[PDB]
Amino acid sequence: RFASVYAWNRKRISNCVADYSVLYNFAPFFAFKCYGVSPTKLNDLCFTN
Amino acid sequence: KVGGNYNYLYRLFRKSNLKPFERDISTEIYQAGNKPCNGVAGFNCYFPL
């Protein structure tokens, strides 16, 4: 179960492999939009937070 | 124009980098690879223009 929108949680990830493989989690997505970063190129990029 | 000027477009992502002074008139959709895409699709089969 997820949290409400007024008390949304935030989980910090800083010491894990950023493997963007969201395809196996309900692949027929209703709204999959990307802002500033390409969809397929995100898997080969490093960030801070 | 106010919410117009659709005649000028661009390509945000392509299957391969264009050669120097290379021109591409076609605007086919990039294949996803992990999922067979014929028409519209999700992750990696969006419209380039």
Name the method of structure determination.
cryo-EM
Shortest distance between the Cα of A17 and any Cα of chain B, in A, equals 20
Cβ distance of A41 and B46 shorter than 8 Å: no
Which residue type, as a one-letter code, is found at position B15? K
Cβ distance of B43 and A23 shorter than 8 Å: yes
Task: Tell me the chain A residues in contact with residue B13 when contact means C-beta distances shorter than 8 Å.
Answer: 38, 40-41
Angstrom distance (rounded) from CA B2 to CA A18: 41
Angstrom distance (rounded) from CA A33 to CA B42: 10
Query: Number of C-alpha atoms within 13 angstroms, CB side, residue B15?
Result: 11
Cβ distance of B35 and A23 shorter than 8 Å: yes
Residue in B closest to A29 by C-alpha = B42
Q: Entry resolution in angstroms?
A: 3.4
For residue B13, what are its two tokens? Answer: 């992502």
Cβ distance of B35 and A27 shorter than 8 Å: yes
Angstrom distance (rounded) from CA A26 to CA A24: 6
Question: DSSP letter string over B1-49?
Answer: -TT--TT----S--SSPPPTT------PPPP-SSS--SSS-SSS-----
At residue B20, what are phi and psi to the nearest 5 degrees?
-60, 130
